[PDB]
Design a protein around this ligand. Structure first.
Ligand SMILES: [Ca+2]
Ligand SMILES: [Ca+2]
Ligand SMILES: [Cl-]
Ligand SMILES: [Cl-]
Ligand SMILES: [Cl-]
Ligand SMILES: [Cl-]
Length: 265
């Protein structure tokens, strides 16, 4: 447990006999549904931390089941907030095994929940507690932006490490173009700048220290993507936390955490 994930080093993929290592990488195909994959994986690791099985949430159900006017669910993404909204509106969260994802089905009619389907949100509550002395908490999610921590990156890193330890992951936003380089197919720690904006949700799932090719002591995030297990390094990659000095923007644009109440299993 602690030997695989502590303040200095965290890689739960190395503990083959634990829940999070059994959440296999998924392939979103050719729709812009990373918001669903990253959000549901964050809930999957939270469920692992609470003693539940590594049961995959149905990304397709979340894509296809929404209230109100028709949305463009393949060509355009959404946000983690909308993932939460779908959970609260429908109250039921089916398993991938019951309604399996194929990108060509993204946008089809929301399916009837069958009698034998598993609810992976049973006994689950999104928290909207008003605890702080201001009116801004209680959204069900909390977001932090690297640009707002420009002069306090140590705090940004600490917040993320704490959540990865406690919840098993955070949701992170990046610009997809930034991981498109030929070089992202290696096992090297990538080192690059982010952009002013982001458009693709991934998960930070771990971290560690390393020495870069210039002989400098540095640290990296371990990042999970949803482009299948043959992308990057078995579906994941490593990226320098602080990145190059000259960067206006960090590679990690922002992170999102879900605030939920879930009974231990
Ligand atoms: Ca760029
Ligand atoms: Ca910006
Ligand atoms: Cl775990
Ligand atoms: Cl569409
Ligand atoms: Cl999105
Ligand atoms: Cl709100």
């Amino acid at each position: 447990d602690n030997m695989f994930c502590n303040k200095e080093y965290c890689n739960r993929l190395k503990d083959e006999n634990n829940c999070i290592s059994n959440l296999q990488v998924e392939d979103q195909g050719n729709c812009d549904t990373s918001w669903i994959f990253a959000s549901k994986y964050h809930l999957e690791t939270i469920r692992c931390m609470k003693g539940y099985e590594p049961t995959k949430i149905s990304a397709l159900y979340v894509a296809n089941c929404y209230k109100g006017e028709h949305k463009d669910r393949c060509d355009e993404g959404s946000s983690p907030m909308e993932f939460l909204q779908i959970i609260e509106d429908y109250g039921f969260l089916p398993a991938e095994s019951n309604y399996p994802y194929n990108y060509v089905k993204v946008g089809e009619q929301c399916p009837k929940v069958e009698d034998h389907w598993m609810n992976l949100w049973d006994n689950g509550k999104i928290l909207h507690n008003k605890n702080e002395p201001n009116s801004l908490d209680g959204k069900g999610y909390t977001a932090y932006e690297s640009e707002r921590f420009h002069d306090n990156m140590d705090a940004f890193v600490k917040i993320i490490k704490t959540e990865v330890m406690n919840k098993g992951s955070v949701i992170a936003y990046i610009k997809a173009e930034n991981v498109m380089g030929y070089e992202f197919s290696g096992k090297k720690v990538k080192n690059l700048c982010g952009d002013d904006t982001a458009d693709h949700a991934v998960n930070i799932v771990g971290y560690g220290n390393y020495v870069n090719s210039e002989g400098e002591k540095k640290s990296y995030w371990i990042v999970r993507n949803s482009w299948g297990p043959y992308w990057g390094d078995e579906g994941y990659f490593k990226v320098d936390m602080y990145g190059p000095t000259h960067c206006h923007f960090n590679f990690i644009h922002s992170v999102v955490i879900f605030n939920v109440d879930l009974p231990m299993n």
